[PDB]
Design a protein around this ligand. Structure first.
Ligand SMILES: CC(C)C[C@H](NP(=O)(O)CNC(=O)OCc1ccccc1)C(=O)NCCC(C)(C)C
Ligand SMILES: [Ca+2]
Ligand SMILES: [Ca+2]
Ligand SMILES: [Ca+2]
Ligand SMILES: [Ca+2]
Ligand SMILES: [Zn+2]
Length: 316
């Protein structure tokens, strides 16, 4: 909407206060004009018709319980935008400052979040498996990264290409979490998963097997559930990425860590220059090796570490 840029204040899902960029025209809207062609957050009002209505507030204060998922969807979309722009010189998900749209309060008891081809969508959870999912910065960045993938490599959402698609979202979700630097870790969704159970998460990149996901190609799922295991087999690539960054010895194969920033550069280049809609795990290895070669040179530690990491997870 047309209006003047304003700064509201509110409380997110976890009870933390933050400032949000809003727009004033009669109401204060969750419309941040400071980033690209805007970040827009909508109320789906417990229904499934999207996007719903652009979030309107009378006083620019967002401290109501109902406001919390909107505050976080809006704020964390801003952090994710900043990560892609500042770290990768990418302007929004399409590279041309496309407006970023999110809806919260989607459906009832909805234990998921997704990119629907056009926008991000967040359930509130059922209070048992999840609380409102926009409360996780890794979750928000995971969702926006699906948009980045769709505009770039275009990895088809099934089988190996789909598991790479998933891993890319977990990798960048985690790198954005580190970028914001509040309780960062290599776990996925810990801030919004199972409020009655401490210390767990939906997935682990450092040890995927702790939640039953494979950490080696020989343990891959080959059935048809979950689009051929896209949220399961992502563990194999998540583990490789973790090893590239942090190092370790895994099934007897030692990997020299090169750090998060270099991991991000290598995978961003692979995603945007080398991967295609049908890339499989072997092709991802080749893309990562080539990307590291471009960035650091064929004889570099970085290239050697990429090879070690894929070796460790059984991907040739
Ligand atoms: C980071 C987490 C919190 C959310 C993450 N959501 P996602 O974006 O991967 C779910 N997306 C999804 O299933 O896509 C399917 C889809 C395709 C095309 C259009 C619309 C939807 C996830 O791992 N969902 C799976 C959760 C489950 C089912 C394992 C509990
Ligand atoms: Ca208010
Ligand atoms: Ca964390
Ligand atoms: Ca995390
Ligand atoms: Ca928990
Ligand atoms: Zn996903």
């Amino acid at each position: 909407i047309t209006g003047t840029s304003t700064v509201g204040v509110g409380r997110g899902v976890l009870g933390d206060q933050k400032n949000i960029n809003t727009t004033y025209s009669t109401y204060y809207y969750l419309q941040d004009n400071t980033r690209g062609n805007g970040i827009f957050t909508y109320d789906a009002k417990y229904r499934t018709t999207l996007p719903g209505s652009l979030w309107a507030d009378a006083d620019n204060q967002f401290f109501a319980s109902y406001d919390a998922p909107a505050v976080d969807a809006h704020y964390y979309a801003g952090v994710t935008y900043d990560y892609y722009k500042n770290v990768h010189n990418r302007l929004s998900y399409d590279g041309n400052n496309a407006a970023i749209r999110s809806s919260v309060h989607y459906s009832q008891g909805y234990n998921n979040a997704f990119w629907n081809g056009s926008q991000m969508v967040y359930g509130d959870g059922d209070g048992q498996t999840f609380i409102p999912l926009s409360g996780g910065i890794d979750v928000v960045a995971h969702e926006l990264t699906h948009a980045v993938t769709d505009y770039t490599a275009g990895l088809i959402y099934q089988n190996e290409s789909g598991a790479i698609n998933e891993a890319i979202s977990d990798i960048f979700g985690t790198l954005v979490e580190f970028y914001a630097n509040k309780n960062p870790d290599w776990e996925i969704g810990e801030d919004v998963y199972t409020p009655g159970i401490s210390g767990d998460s939906l997935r682990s990149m450092s040890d995927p097997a702790k939640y039953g996901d494979p950490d080696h190609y020989s343990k891959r799922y080959t059935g048809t559930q979950d689009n051929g295991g896209v949220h399961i087999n992502s563990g194999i690539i998540n583990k490789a990425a973790y090893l590239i960054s942090q190092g370790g010895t895994h099934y007897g194969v030692s990997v020299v860590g090169i750090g998060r920033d270099k991991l991000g550069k290598i995978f961003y280049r692979a995603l945007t220059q080398y991967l295609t809609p049908t890339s499989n795990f072997s092709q991802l290895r080749a893309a990562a090796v080539q990307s590291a070669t471009d960035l650091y040179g064929s004889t570099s530690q970085e290239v050697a570490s990429v090879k070690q990491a894929f070796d460790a997870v059984g991907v040739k």
